[PDB]
Amino acid sequence: VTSAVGGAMVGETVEGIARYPINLRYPQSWRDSPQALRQLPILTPMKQQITLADVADIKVSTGPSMLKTENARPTSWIYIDARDRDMVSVVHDLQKAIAEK
Amino acid sequence: RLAQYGISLAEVKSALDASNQEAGGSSIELAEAEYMVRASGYLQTLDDFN
Amino acid sequence: RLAQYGISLAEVKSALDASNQEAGGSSIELAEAEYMVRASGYLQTLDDFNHIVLKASENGVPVYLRDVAKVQIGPEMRRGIAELNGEGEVAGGVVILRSGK
Amino acid sequence: TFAQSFPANVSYNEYQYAIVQARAAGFIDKVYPLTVGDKVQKGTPLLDLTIPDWVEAQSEYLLLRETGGTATQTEGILERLRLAGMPEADIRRLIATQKIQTRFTLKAPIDGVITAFDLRAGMNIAKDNVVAKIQGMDPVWVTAAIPESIAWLVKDASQFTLTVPARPDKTLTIRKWTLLPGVDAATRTLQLRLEVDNADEALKPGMNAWLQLNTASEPMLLIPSQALIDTGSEQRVITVDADGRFVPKRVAVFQASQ
Amino acid sequence: TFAQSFPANVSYNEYQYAIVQARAAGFIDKVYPLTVGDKVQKGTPLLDLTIPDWVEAQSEYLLLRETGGTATQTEGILERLRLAGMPEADIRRLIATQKIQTRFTLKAPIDGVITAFDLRAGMNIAKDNVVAKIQGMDPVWVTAAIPESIAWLVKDASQFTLTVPARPDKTLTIRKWTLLPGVDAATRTLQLRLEVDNADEALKPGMNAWLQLNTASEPMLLIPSQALIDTGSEQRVITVDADGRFVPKRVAVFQASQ
After folding, report:
1. What is the DSSP letter of B31?
2. In what order do the strands lie in the sheet with D235-240?
3. Nearest residue on chain D to C1, alpha-carbon basis
4. Phi, psi of D71 (to 5 degrees)
5. Long-range contacts from C73-76, C-beta under 8 angstroms, 24+ separation
6. CB neighbour burial string for E216-253, b if at least 16 within 10 angstroms, e if fewer
7. Does A89 touch chain D (CB under 8 A)?
8. Own/partner pairs for C59-62, CB < 8 Å, 24+ apart?
9. Residue among E188, E175, E254 at smallest CA distance from E222
10. What is the 3-state secondary structure of D61-119?
11. Using CA atoms, how far apart are residues E238 and E240, in angstroms rounded to an integer?
12. Do D145 and A59 touch (CB under 8 A)?
C-alpha cells in the first residue's frame, strides 16, 4: 500500500548541498483504480503469486477531508463575500436569517 | 505451547510488532476527485490479537 | 519481473537502503602524513541505481535492480502549484520577513 | 473487455522429448564433442559403443545364409534379433553386408537441446544409463501463471498476445493454448500453456515472457470511468439534458477496466 | 550504444572428458599416488587390478595354440575376448607372452585433472565404479552470463574482450564463440561459451572472468528517455507540432540504452 501502490519515499540522493527523493512504485497501470487494486500483484514470502484482494477487501468510503480545530473543538468556517453593502448591515441581516430559519 | 508449536518467545514478540499500524497508499484520481488510499491494521479486538 | 526473478518488494527496498552512503576508514600514516581512508558508495548515476545488487548465485551471476525495475527521473508529488499570467506552470520564490522587522 | 497481464516462462516442448538408452549392455568406444547445453540435430552422433549381446544370433544367421537355409528359417532369426533390442537399421546393415555387426553408433532421434548426458569416453554402458536427454524447442512452449482468484478472467473466447523482452524485434504467433486442469500448489496459480512458433529459434527456454489477455464480459451499459462518481455508499453520473441542463442520476456499477 | 561487462567463469573443457571404469569386476592390487585435484597426463597409471573374467577364455586360446587350432578358430576365441571387454593392448600381451593375464593396469586416457577418484587400496571393484574422472583444460572453457534483455543485440555481435582478474596479461579479444539455446532461469541470463588456448595453465577452472562488449545497434528512431511517458501498459510521448501546440501520440518502444 505504501510503496507498491503509493509512492512512499525510501531514501534520498546526496548531491553536494542538495538532496533529492528516491522511491519505489508499481507502474500506474496496476494502481489505476479500485478494481486495479483488487488485482494488485503480490509475491508472498513463500513465493506464491497472489492478488491484493486475496488478503484484503477494498472499499470506497467517505470521511474527514481535513480536521479543523479551534481550542481543541472541531469547527467549520463559512466564508461570506459581500461588497456592495456595508458590513455591519449584512451581518445584522445574516444574524436574523440564521436565527429564524 | 511454544515448544509444542516450535515457536520462540522472540518470534511472538516480532509478530506482535508487525500487527498494529495503519498505512497510507497516497491518493488516486477518480472523477477529478482525490481518493486517499488508507490501509487498516490496528489492533482493536481481542480476536485481532488472537 | 519480481516473480520471474523470485525477488520480493521487501528485498528490493532493503537492497536500495544499503547502496547509498559513504564510510570512513579513519586515517593511516604515510611519510609522516595523515591519509584519510574514504570509501565511496553514494548513488549519483542512474546506472548506480541499475546496479543495486538484489541476489547472487554461487556462480557469481548477480541479479540487479535493473532486472526487476526501470529507474527513471521523474517529478515528485507536487504539494503546491504556481501559474503565471495563465500561460504556464512555473517555479517561484517568496521572501518572508521576520515578524516585527 | 477485461485486460490483465501475466508473467510466463519459455520452456522446452515436452511433446518433443527423447531419452536415448542403449538397447543392450556394452562399453563406450567413442563419445562425440557433445555436452549438456548443446543443441543437436536429428542424426547427430552421440557416441559409439560395442554390444556383444547380438553376435551369437547374428552369426547363427550368417551361416544359415551359407547353408542355404529357408526364408522362414532366416527371417525367424532376424525376428529374434529385433526382439533382442537390435535396431532395425543395424539389422539392415547386417543383411546388406553379411557381416556381423559389433560396433554401433547411437544418433540423436530428434532436433533439440541436450539436457542430460551421463556417458563419457572410457565408461561401460548400461540399459538404464541415459546417453542423452534431448528436448525440442521449435513449437516452443510458453506457460503463464494466473493467480487462482482471477481464474474467471480466462475464457475460451479470450484473446491472447505474447511478448518476450529479449526480442522486441519479434512478433509471436500463438499456435494454440490450454488451461491446464490443476493449479500449481507451490504458487497457487493456474497453468496456461501456449504453443508458439519458433523456427528462427529466437525464443530460448528460460526466457521471460509477458502474456497479455483480453476477455469480453456480458453486455452492459458502458461509460468512461471519469464519468462515474463513487462516494462508497452510492455511485452516480451527471447527465446532460436536452436543454443542456445538468441532472444527476444514480447508477449501479457492474465492473470496470482499462 | 552499448558498453557492458558480463560476468564469466573459467571451467573444464567438456569435450575433454574421461570416466575410467573397469571392463569387468575384480579386486584392487594397488592404487598409485593420486587423488582428486591432481593433474595427470595421458598414460599415467591409476591403479592395478585383478580380473578373473577372461582367464577361462584365455586358456581356450592358449589351449588352441598348443594343439594348432584353425586360424579362424583362433581369431574366434580372440574376438570373443575383446567382446568380453578385455582391452586390445592386454590381448596383445596375451599372445606375446602366451601366459594368461590376470593383473592389469588402468592408465589415464587423456591429459587433465582428476575430479573424481572413487577407488583406493584394499577395495573390490565393479563395472559401475569410477576409478577416475579426468577433465582437461588446455583449450579451457569460459562462459559469460548475458542478461536476456539484449538477446536481439548479441545474436549479431562481432567481438568481445575476455579479461580475467587472476591474470591481467591473459586479456584477449574474442571473435568466435557459441550462444547456447538455453538461458539460466534463476538469473534469466543467456549462456555464451568460448574456448581459450591455455598451454601455460594460466587460466584455471574455478577462476572468475569478465566478458566485455562495446557495440552499437542498427539505426532506429531515437528519443530522450525523459520524453517517454510510460504507464504500466501505455507508452507515449508529447509531440510539439508546427505552431507549438502539444499533441500526445502513442508510440511503440523497442528498447532503451544509455
Report:
1. T
2. D229-230, D235-240, D246-250
3. D7
4. -65, -45
5. C73/C46, C73/E226, C76/A21
6. eeeeeeeeeeeebebeeeeebbeeeeeeeeeeeeebee
7. no
8. C59/E7, C59/E9, C59/E145, C59/E187, C60/E7, C60/E9, C60/E208, C61/E7, C61/E145, C61/E184, C61/E187, C61/E189, C62/E7, C62/E187
9. E254
10. HHHHHHCCCCHHHHHHHHHHHHHCCCCHHHHHHHHHHCCCCCEEEEECCCCEEEEECCC
11. 7
12. no
E115 CB-near residues (< 8 Å, 6+ apart): E12, E36, E37, E133, E134, E135
Chain D residues lying within 8 Å of E180, measured CB to CB: 37-39
Side chain identity at residue E237, one-letter code: V
Q: Is A72 left (phi over 0), alpha (psi -120 to 50) or beta?
A: left
Q: What is the largest CA-CA distance in chain E?
A: 113
In terms of Cβ atoms closer than 10 Å to its own Cβ (0-12, 13-18, 19+), residue E56 is exposed
As a dihedral over the C-alpha atoms of residue E63, residue E65, residue E68, residue E73, rounded to 10 degrees, the angle is 90
Q: Which residues of D are less than 8 Å from B31 in CB distance? A: 225-230
Structural contact between residues D220 and D254, judged by C-beta atoms closer than 8 angstroms: yes
What is the Cα–Cα distance from D68 to D62, expressed in whole angstroms? 10
Please give the Cα distance from E110 to E41 (Å, whole number). 6
Q: What is the identity of the amino acid at B30?
A: L
Experiment used for this model: X-ray
Q: Where are the beta strands (DSSP E) in chain E?
A: 2-11, 17-20, 26-31, 39-40, 45-50, 103-107, 112-116, 124-125, 132-135, 140-147, 160-164, 167-174, 178-184, 189-196, 208-215, 228-230, 235-240, 246-250
Resolution in A: 3.1
Measure the CA–CA gap between E58 and E213, rounded to whole angstroms: 62
